[PDB]
């Protein structure tokens, strides 16, 4: 089921949210356009995005734009199911009641474009929003993990492999800002509504992606595979070309 | 009609897009997104502690401009285009094609948390929050293209925008001062972030940016061939939540 993708009016993400070292066991956010959504192949002309299908699907490859160095970032996505506006405080048990399920997503980033944006203090939008820059899986309904209703913070494990090599493998228990604080903090600035997709950060191990690479990503629940997706990278057509 | 608002999948904006001195007129651009959750319409357009609870079947969201605690807000009056078709990897667009790529235009305010944005700039961090607070995109009803069907060969020079606060005029400029024209904006954007019917594109603001504080009265308008086609007003208030900016 990819239908939830049609109800997504917004995609807000959190950055640098995973511990790289034991000792560290403040936050910034950025948007991603829903036009960047792309779904696995097994789910017009010169077009790199023509809108989602009736069922919310958008099968296609990752379009690496010319001149751009793309880095992959595997992440757990929350599918908000309630209206959250200026929440003063949320407890772990409440995350479950605020979402309809989760999904496995890749927060593709145009590294060199972002490097230049950070240098000039300019918007990150483009480096984070190219078409297909948010490859995502089908939704995993909460009922599938209602048994962990009181706290979902430690049950998930996310991993990403490129060309048969494991590059990222982290558990959500390494998260710096927990799920309940993410939902609460955000609501005090940019109110959330049903259908909103929230990316919660990526674990260490970010690597690059080039045309021809095969990406295999997984989402585990108590070390049990519940999401397995694959994407192929190709050259983005059109006239775009990034040159510093 | 504010129904178009319900169909907007995204809001993209172009920055520093207006000449401030004659000199540049006889001759680079960056973009950023805004959440549709930042939309707010005039009080006469149509729960608890909520500064945004979704749009009505109307497409409206009548309300004040909620200014966050500790935040300094700057107003930016701008012309918004309402895309009507799929634009992806377009190689070239002529001024004449703008009319057929939109269903109309609207008058919008691109509100910004200046001190929050200054900090982001220094730290090289995203502008999202400084540009996305609820109500940070006050916007008018739609102006259907038939209204200006007569200039379908080139709409670049027929509009003018103006913003005034507490009775005093602050911003006033014609779209003829735009550094990057409407057809180029649409074209260039499509080569990175494809557009689909319903997308809203903010096209930049003229010089004269100023501040808005709780209790302020904002009056903005859009003219076509120097005739007022849209006139909207907004009230500023204190954001009612736990948020507070401190440097
Ligand atoms: Ca990320
Ligand atoms: Ca602006």
Curated annotation (Swiss-Prot), chain A:
Requires a divalent metal cation for activity. Its main location: mitochondrion. Induction: In high salinity conditions. The lineage of its organism: Eukaryota, Fungi, Dikarya, Ascomycota, Saccharomycotina. The keyword Mitochondrion applies. Its EC number is 5.3.2.2. It is an enzyme of class 5 (isomerase). It is found in: Mitochondrion. One of its GO terms (biological process) is oxaloacetate metabolic process. It catalyses: oxaloacetate = enol-oxaloacetate. Mg(2+) binds at residues 73, 75, 107. It comes from Saccharomyces cerevisiae (strain ATCC 204508 / S288c). One of its GO terms (molecular function) is metal ion binding. Pfam families: FAA_hydrolase. GO terms for cellular component: mitochondrion. Belongs to the FAH family. Present with 2550 molecules/cell in log phase SD medium. Keywords: Isomerase, Magnesium, Metal-binding, Mitochondrion, Stress response. Its cofactor is Mg(2+); Mn(2+). This is Oxaloacetate tautomerase FMP41, mitochondrial. The keyword NAD does not apply.
């Amino acid at each position: 089921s990819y239908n939830y993708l049609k109800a997504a009016r917004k995609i807000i993400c959190i950055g640098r949210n995973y511990a790289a070292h034991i000792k560290e066991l403040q936050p910034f956010f950025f948007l991603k356009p829903t036009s960047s959504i792309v779904t696995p192949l097994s789910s017009p002309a010169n077009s790199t995005f023509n809108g989602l299908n009736e069922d919310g699907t958008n099968p296609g490859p990752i379009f690496i734009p010319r001149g751009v160095k793309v880095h992959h970032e595997i992440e757990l996505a929350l599918i908000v199911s309630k209206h959250l506006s200026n929440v003063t405080k949320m407890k772990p048990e409440e995350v479950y009641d605020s979402i309809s399920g989760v999904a496995l997503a890749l927060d593709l980033t145009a590294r060199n474009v972002q490097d230049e944006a950070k240098k000039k203090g300019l918007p990150w939008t483009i480096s984070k929003g190219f078409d297909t820059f948010m490859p995502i899986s089908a939704i995993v309904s909460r009922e599938k993990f209602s048994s962990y209703k009181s706290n979902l913070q430690d049950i998930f494990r996310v991993k990403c492999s490129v060309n048969g090599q494991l590059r990222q493998d982290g558990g959500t228990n390494l998260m710096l800002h927990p799920l309940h604080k993410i939902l609460q903090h955000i609501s005090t600035m940019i109110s959330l509504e049903p259908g909103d997709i929230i990316l919660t950060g990526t674990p260490a191990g970010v690597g690059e992606l080039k045309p021809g690479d095969r990406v295999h990503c997984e989402l585990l629940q108590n070390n049990d595979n519940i999401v397995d997706m694959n994407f192929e990278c190709e050259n983005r057509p059109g006239p775009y070309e990034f040159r510093e």
